[PDB]
Amino acid sequence: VNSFSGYLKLTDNVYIKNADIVEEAKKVKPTVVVNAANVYLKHGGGVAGALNKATNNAMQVESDDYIATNGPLKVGGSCVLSGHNLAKHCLHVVGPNVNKGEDIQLLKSAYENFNQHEVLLAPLLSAGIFGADPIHSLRVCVDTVRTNVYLAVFDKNLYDKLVSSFL
């Protein structure tokens, strides 16, 4: 038993809700919140800009030190950093950005990072300003992640489309 509430169960291990991931993070305080990161951990907009804003820019300060030490992430890769006031940990995962021409097959590699964590609160990778089809992203999630994932979808219209079209 865990504290996630109001989710629709899509599969054995994948759940979905129309929710603001920032508000869901602040209420649940999950062990892991996933950020929709880029390789530079520049959290300017989308999910990342919103998570960073909610930390009063502490996420960005921590991220800049991480990059100065380690260099950029790989597309499809991840790193674990602090969850600040939102979660114990933040798993920064880089899905491909279609608006940068990156290979959509890397979306499966991105979701594989979730399997290193027993339970996660997450957005749909590569959705939103990353330019992928969220229905495709949901399918890759369900077919790749084996751990327990609670997906927060900000847009109610997108949410109902995702549920109604789910196979």
Ligand X SMILES: Nc1ncnc2[nH]c3cc(F)ccc3c12
Residues in touch with ligand X (CB under 6 A): 20-22, 46-47, 50, 123, 127-128, 152-154
Q: Nearer Cβ to ligand X, position 21 or 162?
A: 21
Shortest distance, position 7 Cβ to ligand X, whole Å: 13
3-state secondary structure the chain: CCCCCCCEECCCCEEEEECCHHHHHHHHCCCEEEEECCCCCCCCCHHHHHHHHHCCCHHHHHHHHHHHHHCCCCCCCEEEEECCCCCCEEEEECCCCHHHCCCCCHHHHHHHHHHHCCEEEECCCCCHHHCCCHHHHHHHHHHHCCCEEEEEECCHHHHHHHHHCCC
Q: Nearer Cβ to ligand X, position 36 or 75?
A: 36
Q: Nearer Cβ to ligand X, position 70 or 78?
A: 78
Shortest distance, position 69 Cβ to ligand X, whole Å: 28
Shortest distance, position 55 Cβ to ligand X, whole Å: 13
Q: Nearer Cβ to ligand X, position 46 or 83?
A: 46
Shortest distance, position 41 Cβ to ligand X, whole Å: 17
Q: Nearer Cβ to ligand X, position 44 or 65?
A: 44
Shortest distance, position 36 Cβ to ligand X, whole Å: 7
Ramachandran category for residue 138: left, alpha or beta (phi over 0 → left; psi -120 to 50 → alpha): alpha
